[PDB]
């Protein structure tokens, strides 16, 4: 219940924006239950805000994602149903912070928290798939280019591939739905937007399709040598 007056007091004044951590630690029991942290404050504030970037809060978001519960932030930015609204102004900052968030690595949860975060980021990728749909008309490609670029970026191999495989082997229906949505997006993307556009999206689609294929596919070559093994054993 304290979270309401807490966020009220927070937004009510323009604090130093770094003394916020101290003010929170003081006003909060400092370890009672961190599931009522800024994690949901961003979304519950942006809901009523709608067509507004809500500044002075992204700084708090950054000072939180510095060292806080990354899992809750991930699941809450995943379940954020902003594709329907498609503000293209707030979701832009959301993808920007998510990029630097997923760039380096995740953190340890000493439990299946990692698998939960993986499922969350899978749902987040599903959400990102709607970027081209929100940018199909674009009568009033900027967001589409950046979204497909971040999509391609997030596919760093030997880092998340095993995690995505685990996630896919932990539940299928969600993954099949994501694949069907990807197919639908690729089909809807059959318009000649640009040379780079509608071309790299297919590449990311094939990459996503190859994600559950295998992780150690035999790609070696140039083995110019008559193998005597089979010869001798035969």
């Amino acid at each position: 219940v304290n979270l309401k007056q807490a966020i009220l007091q927070a937004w009510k004044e323009r604090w130093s924006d770094y003394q916020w951590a101290i003010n929170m630690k003081k006003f909060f029991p400092k370890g009672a239950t961190w599931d009522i942290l800024n994690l949901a404050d961003a979304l519950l504030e942006q809901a009523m805000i709608g067509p507004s970037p809500n500044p002075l809060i992204l700084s708090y978001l950054k000072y939180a994602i510095s060292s806080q519960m990354v899992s809750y932030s991930s699941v809450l930015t995943a379940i954020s149903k902003f594709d329907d609204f498609s503000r293209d102004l707030c979701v832009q900052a959301l993808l920007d912070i998510m990029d630097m968030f997923c760039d380096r690595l995740s953190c340890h949860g000493k439990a299946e928290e990692c698998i939960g975060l993986c499922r969350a980021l899978l749902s987040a990728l599903h959400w990102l798939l709607r970027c081209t749909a929100a940018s199909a008309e674009r009568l009033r490609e900027k967001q589409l280019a950046m979204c497909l670029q971040r999509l391609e970026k997030t596919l760093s191999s030997t880092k998340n591939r095993a995690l995505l495989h685990i996630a896919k082997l932990e539940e299928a229906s969600s993954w099949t739905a994501i694949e069907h949505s990807l197919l639908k997006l690729g089909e809807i993307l059959a318009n000649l937007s640009n040379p780079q556009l509608r071309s790299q999206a297919e590449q990311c689609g094939t990459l996503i399709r190859s994600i559950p294929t295998m992780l150690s596919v035999h790609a070696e070559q140039m083995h110019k040598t008559g193998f005597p093994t089979v010869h001798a054993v035969i």
Partner: peptide, 12 residues
């Protein structure tokens, strides 16, 4: 290590 005092925390 995580400094817990009357100040803003940081990366450990």
């Amino acid at each position: 290590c995580k400094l817990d005092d009357k100040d803003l925390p940081s990366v450990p």
